[PDB]
A paper describes a structure:
The four point mutations that allowed evolving EGFP into rsEGFP2 (T65A, Q69L, V163S, A206K)16 were thus engineered in Superfolder-[name], yielding a new PTFP that we named rsFolder. Models were refined at 1.45 Å (on state) and 1.50 Å (off state) resolution for rsEGFP2, and at 1.50 Å (on state) and 2.35 Å (off state) resolution for rsFolder, respectively. The experimental Fourier difference maps provide evidence that in both RSFPs, off-switching indeed results from cis-trans isomerisation of the chromophore. However, a drastically different scenario is seen in rsFolder, where Tyr146 is replaced by a hydrophobic phenylalanine, one of the mutations inherited from Superfolder-[name]. In the on state, the phenolate oxygen of the cis chromophore is H-bonded to Thr204, a water molecule and His149. Upon isomerisation the interactions with the two first partners are lost, while His149 and the phenolate oxygen remain H-bonded, resulting in a trans conformation of the chromophore that is a mirror image of the cis conformation. This highly unusual mechanism results in the off-state chromophore of rsFolder remaining tightly attached to the barrel scaffold and likely explains its exceptional thermal stability. First, the thermal stability of its off state (~64 hours) is 15 times higher than that of rsEGFP2 and, to our knowledge, unprecedented amidst RSFPs.
Notably, methods such as RESOLFT (REversible Saturable OpticaL Fluorescence Transitions), nonlinear SIM (Structured Illumination Microscopy)5 or pcSOFI (photochromic Stochastic Optical Fluctuation Imaging)6 exploit reversibly switchable fluorescent proteins (RSFPs) that are able to repeatedly toggle between a fluorescent (‘on’) and a non-fluorescent (‘off’) state. However, the development of RESOLFT nanoscopy in live cells necessitates RSFPs that switch efficiently even at low illumination power (to minimise photo-damage), display minimal residual fluorescence in the off state (to maximise contrast), and are highly resistant against switching fatigue (to sustain a large number of successive on-off switching cycles). It was found that variants engineered from fluorescent proteins of hydrozoan origin (jellyfishes), and notably from the well-known EGFP, could fulfil these requirements, giving rise to rsEGFP15 and rsEGFP216. To shed light on the switching mechanisms of rsFolder and rsEGFP2, we solved their crystallographic structures in both the on and off states.
Residue numbers in the entry: 3 to 65, 69 to 232
Amino acid sequence: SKGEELFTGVVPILVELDGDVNGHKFSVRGEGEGDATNGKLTLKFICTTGKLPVPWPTLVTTLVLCFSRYPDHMKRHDFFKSAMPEGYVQERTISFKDDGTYKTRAEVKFEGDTLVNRIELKGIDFKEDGNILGHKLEYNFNSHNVYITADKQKNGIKSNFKIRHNVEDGSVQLADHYQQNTPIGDGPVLLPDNHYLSTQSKLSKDPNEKRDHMVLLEFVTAAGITH
């Protein structure tokens, strides 16, 4: 694909989220860089409206899978890069078991030389005592495989998966993701055979930063295709 050539090296990233959870309005802004050659992603996020009303880990999936390393033999199954530079829409429903639901719509696309992920998030039916509004989740993010399938009808891809968030008390908060991606342009895109992305993520803090923030290191690498 032509989009793919855009990802030949380190690409600078902008992320912008406008959120509303149970009425609590907040905004997140993130900056950094991605490298699809090595499947590597480094981002620093700041809650620009003050304290974040939800826990940072819950926003990880929402806050650029075009930066997944697709191995050479899988290059033809890389929807995400193929939709660039005009980009793609990534919509999700995230149901937190026994708790509220995020609904998200994002556009991931190049603006100038910068890959931008611009997100609207609405959160509803959250329990004030729950693990989310109650900030009961550990500051981390498990390794995880997410399965990608083609959606020929929508000319894109879809994915269902469960994210397991560790709770303080040693239990697990499940977050059921239903995901759909569709091209923003009307050019041709790569529709993949079934495969999955292998994710590892490291959450940390900038010791110099006073604002409520997350430093995120991510590796994502496609797999599951025979040869």
